[PDB]
Amino acid sequence: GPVPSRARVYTDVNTHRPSEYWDYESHVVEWGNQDDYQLVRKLGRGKYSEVFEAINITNNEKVVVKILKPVAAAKIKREIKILENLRGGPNIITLADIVKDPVSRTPALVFEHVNNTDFKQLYQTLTDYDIRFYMYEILKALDYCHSMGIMHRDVKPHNVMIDHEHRKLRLIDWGLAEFYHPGQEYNVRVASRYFKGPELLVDYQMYDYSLDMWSLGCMLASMIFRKEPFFHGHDNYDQLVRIAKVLGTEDLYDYIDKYNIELDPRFNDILGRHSRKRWERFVHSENQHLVSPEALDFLDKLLRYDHQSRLTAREAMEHPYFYTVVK
Numbered sequence: 001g002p003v004p005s006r007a008r009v010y011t012d013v014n015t016h017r018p019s020e021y022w023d024y025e026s027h028v029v030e031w032g033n034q035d036d037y038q039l040v041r042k043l044g045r046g047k048y049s050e051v052f053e054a055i056n057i058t059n060n061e062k063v064v065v066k067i068l069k070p071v072a073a074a075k076i077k078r079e080i081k082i083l084e085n086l087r088g089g090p091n092i093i094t095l096a097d098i099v100k101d102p103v104s105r106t107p108a109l110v111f112e113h114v115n116n117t118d119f120k121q122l123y124q125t126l127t128d129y130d131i132r133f134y135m136y137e138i139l140k141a142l143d144y145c146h147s148m149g150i151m152h153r154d155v156k157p158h159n160v161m162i163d164h165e166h167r168k169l170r171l172i173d174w175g176l177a178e179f180y181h182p183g184q185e186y187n188v189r190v191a192s193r194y195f196k197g198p199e200l201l202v203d204y205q206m207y208d209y210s211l212d213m214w215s216l217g218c219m220l221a222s223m224i225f226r227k228e229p230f231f232h233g234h235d236n237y238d239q240l241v242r243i244a245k246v247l248g249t250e251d252l253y254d255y256i257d258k259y260n261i262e263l264d265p266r267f268n269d270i271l272g273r274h275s276r277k278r279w280e281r282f283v284h285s286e287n288q289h290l291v292s293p294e295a296l297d298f299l300d301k302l303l304r305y306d307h308q309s310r311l312t313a314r315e316a317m318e319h320p321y322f323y324t325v326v327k
């Protein structure tokens, strides 16, 4: 069967932790008082969540309330444990309370207020410097969670809140996050189609933190090339094809051979044969102000089929692309 794989960094962090840290099913949820909060305005919406702006009437401070739909509610213990474990980490949203509506019996997560700039889904809104600066901020959150033994598994623009006035960012929606345990096989039905790594698309279950790095590379490519999304798959099978049209089928086959991965027969008629493209092909007059040799080099080192070859979050922070960012 498939060749086993392990993360090349933070491999055994969970193994060294007491079971209460990662054994989320054993966690006992202490419920707060839902009557401590009054809803003020709607901030946004997710497929399995409703997000509102609220006031904690006990201290008159603004808070963010995330009401959970049944599928999100079933994995509450995991999301709570992960949020509590990461609380106080750089650029991680801060869980303030956990409440339950006695009327609808639905749970909600309360977070400390996050000043959120509404970009209104307009992504041609950042300069080259700002892209580097905010990518560095995302990397701080990813290196932190990976160091704590957690993979986000849903990195995308929707899960990143930016306070553009104070130049601060938060990585949010940890509902799909999981604890990394070497040799564990995970569900590949994670993330959002456009941000899924090749490991998920080829059903390779022994993945790790590097999955997040692929997703981050998808975000970067969409931003520097002004192409939303960068890999525009019609479905999960076509998603790999779109990837293969850029990275090439040769390296894809080398990847599947390395890990002795059995490809699903639908791909036979759809993958074809494609040359690996040079990143310079996506450079045009409308996006040249966002592209530099350092950006293309950095992107190249994230968007690799082989999850073990991609830069880790800390290696990415060392990249020359970030030398211009004030630290």
Ligand SMILES: CCc1ccccc1-c1ccc(CNCCc2nc3ccccc3[nH]2)cc1OC
Binding pocket: 043, 044, 045, 051, 116, 119, 122, 123, 125, 126, 131, 134, 135, 138, 156, 157, 158, 159, 160, 161, 162, 219, 220, 222, 223
């Ligand atoms: C790091 C900048 C960046 C670089 C590359 C590609 C994209 C971006 C980028 C990332 C995030 C955002 C803003 N995302 C807000 C999403 C959001 N608002 C919510 C309100 C309520 C509930 C949930 C929400 N979720 C903009 C970006 O570029 C302009």
